[PDB]
Amino acid sequence: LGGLERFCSPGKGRGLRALQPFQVGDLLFSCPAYAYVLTVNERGNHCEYCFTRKEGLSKCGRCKQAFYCNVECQKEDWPMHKLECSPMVVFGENWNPSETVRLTARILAKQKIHPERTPSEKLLAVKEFESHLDKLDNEKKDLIQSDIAALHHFYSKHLGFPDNDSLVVLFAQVNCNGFTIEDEELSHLGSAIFPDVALMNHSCCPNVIVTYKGTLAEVRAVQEIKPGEEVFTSYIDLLYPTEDRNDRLRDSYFFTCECQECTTKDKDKAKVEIRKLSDPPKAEAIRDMVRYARNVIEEFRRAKHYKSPSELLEICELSQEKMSSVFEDSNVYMLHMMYQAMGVCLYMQDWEGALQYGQKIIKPYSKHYPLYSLNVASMWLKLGRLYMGLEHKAAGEKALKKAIAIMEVAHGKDHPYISEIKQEIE
Ligand SMILES: CCN(C(=O)CO)[C@H]1CN(/C(=N/C#N)Nc2cccc(OC(F)F)c2)N=C1c1ccc(Cl)c(Cl)c1
Numbered sequence: 001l002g003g004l005e006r007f008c009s010p011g012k013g014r015g016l017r018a019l020q021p022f023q024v025g026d027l028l029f030s031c032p033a034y035a036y037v038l039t040v041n042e043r044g045n046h047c048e049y050c051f052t053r054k055e056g057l058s059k060c061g062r063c064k065q066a067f068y069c070n071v072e073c074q075k076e077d078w079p080m081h082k083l084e085c086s087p088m089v090v091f092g093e094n095w096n097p098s099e100t101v102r103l104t105a106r107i108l109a110k111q112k113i114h115p116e117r118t119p120s121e122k123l124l125a126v127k128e129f130e131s132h133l134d135k136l137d138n139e140k141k142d143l144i145q146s147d148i149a150a151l152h153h154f155y156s157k158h159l160g161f162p163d164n165d166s167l168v169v170l171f172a173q174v175n176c177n178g179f180t181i182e183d184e185e186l187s188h189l190g191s192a193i194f195p196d197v198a199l200m201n202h203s204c205c206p207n208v209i210v211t212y213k214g215t216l217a218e219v220r221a222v223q224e225i226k227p228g229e230e231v232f233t234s235y236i237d238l239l240y241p242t243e244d245r246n247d248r249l250r251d252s253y254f255f256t257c258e259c260q261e262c263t264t265k266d267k268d269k270a271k272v273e274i275r276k277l278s279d280p281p282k283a284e285a286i287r288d289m290v291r292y293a294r295n296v297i298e299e300f301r302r303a304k305h306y307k308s309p310s311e312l313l314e315i316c317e318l319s320q321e322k323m324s325s326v327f328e329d330s331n332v333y334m335l336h337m338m339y340q341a342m343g344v345c346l347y348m349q350d351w352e353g354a355l356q357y358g359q360k361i362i363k364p365y366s367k368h369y370p371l372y373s374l375n376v377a378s379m380w381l382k383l384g385r386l387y388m389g390l391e392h393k394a395a396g397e398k399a400l401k402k403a404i405a406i407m408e409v410a411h412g413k414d415h416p417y418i419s420e421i422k423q424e425i426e
């Protein structure tokens with residue numbers, strides 16, 4: 001950092017520019033989390049302060065509902081954990097703020113405790129975050145209002161608040177600039193604010209990838225970067241077609257991408273691969289599958305909220321059956337449901353069924369994603385741990401090696417995950 005600088009990039013509000021070349025694999029900069037939270041389902045598995053996984057975690061005696069490496073982690077998290085420690089007890093069962101409210105509460109405590117610029121904000125301050133307030137519709141304002149309501153309700157014991165308009169601003173800023181922290185398998189660990197990382201604008205063919213080392217964000221080049229060019233990361237999963245991606249970006253971030261990918265659209269035809277039946281299906285038909293697919297994707301978002309693994313699995317198979325009438329297995333809509341089914345299979349400790357979906361998914365992933373992709377890497381990694389688990393040592397070794405090859409670029413040669421995975425090549 002300083003190796004680069006900010007600049008008021010066109011059509012793009014602000015963004016980040018290289019002053020020097022970066023090679024593939026190079027660490028552009030890193031950014032300690034300004035605020036963060038460990039996701040509720042990872043309670044008991046990871047330290048709430050540093051996010052390390054441990055079998056042996058010391059508990060908060062106070063509320064017996066937060067876990068730490070040791071008394072230093074616990075002490076260091078206290079200022080934040082105190083926002084939730086006693087209210088979890090008053091509320092018990094009914095303590096259930098969204099992750100966004102939990103993160104936003106910590107921002108507010110941070111601003112109070114440390115109003116000045118932090119090391120997390122060398123180029124973009126939290127106070128300066130784009131909010132797109134003027135673009136939010138009733139629905140999005142309504143959701144933020146719920147969030148404000150929840151915040152007051154749950155965090156009043158030890159937090160005071162600013163007026164409503166300031167809060168609406170803050171929550172909008174959070175949606176526009178908040179990150180998720182995910183592990184080596186892209187499992188959700190929590191959410192965070194990385195202000196200097198958030199200065200980076202998006203591309204569907206990014207030249208950098210963002211990874212996490214505990215709660216520290218790191219940014220590395222996945223294409224060579226020339227002096228004067230804009231540093232772009234991806235805000236979304238790059239698997240989907242150009243339309244599906246831009247619906248996402250406009251909805252979450254109020255812009256339409258004009259990157260080479262979203263322009264030429266060169267990868268679209270392959271993502272929507274169609275089966276060759278002596279007499280093909282006509283276009284009418286296709287639309288009805290495509291619409292049926294996305295539609296389903298939205299409906300599967302749901303059943304996770306409550307349905308049995310047995311019955312989530314069931315919908316994946318039926319949807320795949322139907323869909324395959326006209327879609328090839330290499331088709332992304334087929335890959336989505338395969339992926340989701342693989343997730344279900346892993347939750348049931350159904351290793352072999354997880355493995356079958358994995359094997360069908362990986363080769364299309366490599367086609368559809370770019371050269372260095374956390375999605376491809378985490379799929380190889382999952383394949384390799386499944387093979388090793390069934391004692392297919394040779395295939396496991398090969399798959400774990402493919403993940404390492406990507407991760408060395410994206411996470412760095414010395415990342416602790418690499419170290420873990422190398423030991424596993426055994
Ligand atoms: C898929 C890649 N992303 C990751 O965060 C990867 O770790 C997206 C996804 N994204 C968010 N998703 C969610 N949820 N951010 C987010 C959005 C709303 C709220 C939120 O935190 C909540 F706790 F407040 C976090 N935010 C992302 C993101 C990526 C790059 C940049 Cl520069 C920024 Cl500002 C956001």
Ligand SMILES: C[S@@+](CC[C@H](N)C(=O)[O-])C[C@H]1O[C@@H](n2cnc3c(N)ncnc32)[C@H](O)[C@@H]1O
Binds near residue numbers: 202255
């Ligand atoms: C995390 S911010 C990036 C920093 C932002 N450009 C700024 O000055 O605050 C997310 C926002 O930046 C803008 N942005 C990012 N990538 C863009 C792109 N490719 N084209 C246009 N605007 C973009 C969008 O307004 C987006 O919601």
Ligand SMILES: [Zn+2]
Binds near residue numbers: 062063065
């Ligand atoms: Zn506690």
Ligand SMILES: [Zn+2]
Binds near residue numbers: 049052070073
């Ligand atoms: Zn710790």
Ligand SMILES: [Zn+2]
Binds near residue numbers: 204257258260262
């Ligand atoms: Zn694009």
